[PDB]
Design an enzyme around this catalytic site. Structure first.
Site, PDB file in Angstrom:
ATOM      1  CG  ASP B 290      -2.418  -1.162   1.032  1.00  0.00           C
ATOM      2  OD1 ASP B 290      -1.653  -2.787   0.942  1.00  0.00           O
ATOM      3  OD2 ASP B 290      -3.043  -0.842   0.788  1.00  0.00           O
ATOM      4  N   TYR B 374     -10.119  -1.815   0.910  1.00  0.00           N
ATOM      5  CA  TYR B 374      -9.498  -1.692   1.621  1.00  0.00           C
ATOM      6  C   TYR B 374      -8.995   0.227   2.460  1.00  0.00           C
TER       7      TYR B 374
END
Ligand SMILES: [Cu+2]
Ligand SMILES: [Cu+2]
EC number: 1.4.3.21
Lengths: 620, 620
Positions: B290, B374
């Site tokens: 990420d 997410y």
């Protein structure tokens, strides 16, 4: 009215009247413990038989008694003469604390010990501590208390800053005699004061803090009926109170759409030991069994609005019995309020263009207790998502000693000449489980790593294993943070929509357990503290990890003897005993007053609900 | 103005103007990353040389470039042509996400794969995921993205409820070609919807919640100057923002009576990997970096009052650069507020008759980011007692797959036919330490148990041991919850009044580290994730645990190569890298929307202050 309602003043009075009439409460008798007994397992009866258990001490040396009274029928159900030399002494009495300072003030070797240190007896405070079970044959069968001296320069002085090391006195509190005075040597008495209210130590109080106002313009979201029944955001429970355990939670349940589902039948902190790691003969006998010996509830403080509890608070004033059977109310002894707990869930979806956010909330039920230099806050939290959590907040003043010139491997230095022995605060939570009913089982879940190779591998796979604890003998578990070890309590006869057994997962903090040598006296008396988890088959008399009478009692009588029965716990009426604690190596920042440190545990739903139970929370 | 101030729109514009003028920003060039460089170690100069690092991608296949620009002097300091086949590809571009769905919509084998499942291409959403480094020789040196399909029944439908298993497509995003389409077999596409806003799934929204109003009638206790400098209850720091790391904390210091004391020079989450534990060839390549590949800051949400942040909130709107160098403001991207944190300290003394209680408070600095399914909340807390804490709140929608009829050892069932692969969310906190200055050292503290016997024993003693980490090669540590293992960062050249080195103790949660086989690709690319603590000697270019270019880059280039230099860390300018994560075995309660789960760590003073630093807090 509910059978789990708090004991009332009128009920205490009735117990007094009944014991008096029966000739069990004469002028020489004292009540060491009194509390309501929980309704029996087969409570399918309308029989509101409100019973009380009472421990009666005799001030003139006669054998103490255990008495069960029925406030309902107005009779004494049973009365047994105890043999304290066999089963242990009764819990210490408040009136006995005073006695040890008074007896020593006129004892010649105590006076000679003080004179040798040039200390004025009128300024010497004696901390009345519990006498464990050690190498003194003359203490067996006798009610003994140990005394440690602390100098108090003036009425408002913090005596804890001035410990008198090298001196200890043993005192028989019933016969009123000083059996021993031990003087291993003189140690300088730390001169520096530890007064946290004196403007010379605190300096000018900061003016930078702006007020934070937390209100509920429409009142709280929870309702209280019957004095102690609570209803909040699908949660339902009864808040009980016992002089020994403190706040006790009964019938914890969650309303899963029309169906009220049980999760925990009874939850309480059943014991809490404070062992000291100082090998010096002055304190090597020191181990507070705050719950077992002193009775935590008896020392619950009255909490103040804005200081102790902030927000829209509703109080519960538990009633307790004094040494003569008169009711004593602990005003504002239990705080209850709900509070915001940040974000519950959130997602901004690119594809659907929908932005979603929900807030979390928790219900708080707490009480604070003070035992000598120690103050502990007990907090139970209930969250919107089904999570249950316990948190112990340890504060107060740290127990002091002298810091030896050469240094120490078991004591920290807090100030010049002032020391603080290493110690632990170990708690035992007794969770009488009812996951969707009484047919429960406990599973131990370990993360399992997989080797790279033929069987589906690129080296990324990892799994999880679950072993069922079937009998009590294999139910003594240890933590394992490396493998992410947790424990699931499930109901094999209650499944979710995916046809899997509903359960709740226990998350432990994984702090160290009892550090004492496995051969020591404390390891025997606090055997429960040596393991993280114990599961037993429920029984009405297996109430405490250590047994009924902790005070001056040998070890084994608790958990280790329960577990020996090797009962079946696979889909049965079970009790989970979780041991959790803090290993306290005092630091400079803990003196003169200790900022809060915390330990606890939580239980989270594990396939208990058919989907997220928080889909119906609105966006306020 | 401060050199740690947030980048401004005008500065972004200047970087664009400078790159254009220099001929580095032609119409075929794109900015993959742009951020301010931190002032140099020897910042004893008045030289406000505001520099920016820029990663320039070429849309027509030419070599990308790394450029450092001085907005101050208005010149290009350095420009280097990258060899992405050697050092890694640049971070994924937002405009490239769209491309993979568009290219596949007209590819014949993709269409044939959909037709074989009777799926209408207009309803197939393709999740553009990062391509790791695996067994495909033709991907090296090329910018590839992998696509996983999810069906969207209607515009507002949650596609995550409808995964298309057995199908994966590799796409070259620069040459705009579909290199591969793999079809391992058809799997039923879960029909059940996962729409958490649809009143049929949510049912009637509860009406029981009463409002909780949190206000500050006199405003906050903290002040903000220079746009990002914060002053609060003796705490002082600068809140920075980088597109890759997100919120970055600079110069964290505490005002210890007249003396401003440094604690942390720079604190940030330098990486966060999300490895999947599903061995299936459809997702065994799945590992979100990420921070490294996507750039967390780029996806920061705009937080709303009352929903995302409750109380008296002050916002920071960080400015970021788009792919062409134009400024883009993330409105209300950073929330800042202080909140009540219960009891700070409390004691009711019997002897002195004094009752004392003080409340605790914490300063909150947070931001939320969304990367596909997410959503992560990053929270930094500062407490009155000197404690510093980080908390990651993981929510959003769980990544789905199909649940195989036979079952799975690496996937959980969330609904009929719907699965969720096992995975971990591992974070790396990079703490550039400055405990009372840059001469720091790290000590590992273990509890030590003592045997009962001759050497001062009754079997109650227990101690603690501390070993100093002197060189980088011995600074790769693992946790040990059994022995209560913690790590103390102290300054040997700065002592407290007891003449002991001032320090701060790091408390880790002790959750499992990377579970992948040590021989796997993810274990190499995310080597930092295999250990709990790493300490390195500071260096300007050692910024990330994985290296500068994570996207499609092999392993080693991060921490393992830094540590190989074996530098001295005993009383030096050191950096602590703490690995902490959550092992997520999805449960029914995580679907359709995931309630928050948390991980973090905290640092507490360890003999840093001469006594309790909270003696001056008033009783409000
Ligand atoms: Cu302690
Ligand atoms: Cu997850």
């Amino acid at each position: 009215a509910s059978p789990f309602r708090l004991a009332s003043a009128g009920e205490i009075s009735e117990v007094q009247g009944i014991l008096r009439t029966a000739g069990l409460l004469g002028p020489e008798k004292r009540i060491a413990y009194l509390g309501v007994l929980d309704p029996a397992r087969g409570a399918g009866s309308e029989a509101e038989d409100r019973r009380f258990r009472v421990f009666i001490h005799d001030v003139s040396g006669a054998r103490p008694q255990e008495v069960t009274v029925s406030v309902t029928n107005g009779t004494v159900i049973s009365a047994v003469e105890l043999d304290t030399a066999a089963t242990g002494e009764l819990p210490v009495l408040e009136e006995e604390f005073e006695v040890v300072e008074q007896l020593l003030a006129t004892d010649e070797r105590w006076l000679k010990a003080l004179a040798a240190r040039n200390l004025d007896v009128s300024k010497v405070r004696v901390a009345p501590l519990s006498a464990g079970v050690f190498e003194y044959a003359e203490e067996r069968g006798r009610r003994i208390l140990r005394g440690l001296a602390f100098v108090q320069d003036f009425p408002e002085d913090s005596a804890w800053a001035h410990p008198v090391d090298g001196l200890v006195a043993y005192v028989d509190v019933v016969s009123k005699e000083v059996t021993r005075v031990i003087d291993t040597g003189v140690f300088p008495v730390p001169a520096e004061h530890g007064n946290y209210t004196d403007p010379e130590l605190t300096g000018p109080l900061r003016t930078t803090q702006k007020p934070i106002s937390i209100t509920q313009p429409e009142g709280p979201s929870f309702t209280v009926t019957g004095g102690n029944h609570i209803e909040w955001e699908k949660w339902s429970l009864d808040v009980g109170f016992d002089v020994r355990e403190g706040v006790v939670l009964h019938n914890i349940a969650f309303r899963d759409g029309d169906r009220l589902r049980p999760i925990i039948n009874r939850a309480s902190i059943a014991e809490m030991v404070v062992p000291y790691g100082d090998p010096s003969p002055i304190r090597s006998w020191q181990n507070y069994f705050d719950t077992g010996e002193y009775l935590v509830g008896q020392y619950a403080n009255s909490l103040e609005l804005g200081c102790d509890c902030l927000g829209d608070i509703t109080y519960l004033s538990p009633v307790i019995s004094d040494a003569f059977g008169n009711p004593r109310e602990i005003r504002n002894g239990i705080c209850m309020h709900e509070e915001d707990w940040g974000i519950l869930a959130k997602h901004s979806d690119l594809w659907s263009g929908i932005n979603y956010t929900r807030r979390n909330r928790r219900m708080v039920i707490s009480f604070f207790t003070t035992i000598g230099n120690y103050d502990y806050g007990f907090y139970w939290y209930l969250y919107l998502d089904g999570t249950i959590e316990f948190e112990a907040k340890a504060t107060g003043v740290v127990f002091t000693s002298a810091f030896p010139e050469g240094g120490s491997d078991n004591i920290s230095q807090l100030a010049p000449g002032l020391g603080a022995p290493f110690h632990q605060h170990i708690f035992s939570a007794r969770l009488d489980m009812a996951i969707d009913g009484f047919t429960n089982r406990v599973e131990e879940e370990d993360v399992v790593r997989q080797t790279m190779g033929p069987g589906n591998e690129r080296g990324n796979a990892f799994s999880r294993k679950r072993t069922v604890l079937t009998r009590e003998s294999e139910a003594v578990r240890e933590a394992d943070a490396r493998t992410g070890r947790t424990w699931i309590i499930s109901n094999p006869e209650s499944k979710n929509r995916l046809n899997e057994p509903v359960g709740y997962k226990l998350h432990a903090h994984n702090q160290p357990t009892l550090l004492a040598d496995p051969g020591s006296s404390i390891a025997r008396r606090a055997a429960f503290a040596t393991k993280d988890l114990w599961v037993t088959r429920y029984a009405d008399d297996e109430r405490y990890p250590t047994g009924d009478f902790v005070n001056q009692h040998s070890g084994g009588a608790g958990l280790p003897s329960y577990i020996a029965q090797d009962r079946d716990i696979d889909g049965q009426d079970i009790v989970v005993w979780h041991t959790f604690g803090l290993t306290h190596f005092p630091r400079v920042e803990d003196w003169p007053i200790m900022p809060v440190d915390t330990v606890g545990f939580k239980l989270r739903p594990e396939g208990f609900f058919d989907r997220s139970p928080v889909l119906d929370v609105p966006a306020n």
